[PDB]
Ligand binder design. Structure first.
Ligand SMILES: Nc1ncnc2c1ncn2[C@@H]1O[C@H](COP(=O)(O)OP(=O)(O)O)[C@@H](O)[C@H]1O
Lengths: 48, 48, 48
């Protein structure tokens, strides 16, 4: 299924390095990042 | 080689932050339950 | 009033650099830190 208005992870990642996120947003982003880790690690993704 | 297919997100600063509670609470009950893993193997076999 | 079990902010601050804090705890440190900023800015502390 197609999902709208996303961008390359590093596009934002770089933009956050410049002007950081309000801590609440950033806590959120980190919650998601951990889900990605678990997912990529279980299926031992070779290409992330 | 361990080098050969890295997870690129591991170089990110966010990868240094320890895992949350939210995530241990979501995952640990599941993947530590030998029944849940066997369902997952089963369901993957069914797809593959 | 004397307060117990505290250490120089920079002592902890540099340890946190070596070991990042769990994001929930870190969100807390940040709320405290904002309060410091507010206080020090209003009284315009000369010596922080
Ligand atoms: N489910 C999706 N929703 C929105 N955009 C997507 C989705 N899947 C892929 N894209 C976008 O389309 C491009 C090509 O997708 P994909 O084929 O998955 O990557 P690659 O080109 O590396 O094989 C990607 O750069 C991505 O931004």
């Amino acid at each position: 299924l197609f999902v709208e208005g996303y961008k390359d992870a590093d596009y934002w990642l770089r933009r956050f390095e410049a002007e950081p996120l309000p801590e609440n947003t950033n806590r959120q982003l980190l919650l998601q990042f951990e889900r990605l880790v678990v997912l990529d690690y279980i299926i031992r993704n070779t290409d992330r | 080689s361990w080098r050969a297919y890295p997870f690129y997100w591991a170089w990110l600063p966010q990868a240094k932050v320890p895992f949350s509670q939210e995530i241990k609470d979501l995952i640990l009950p599941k993947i530590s339950d030998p029944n849940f893993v066997k369902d997952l193997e089963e369901d993957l076999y069914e797809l593959f």
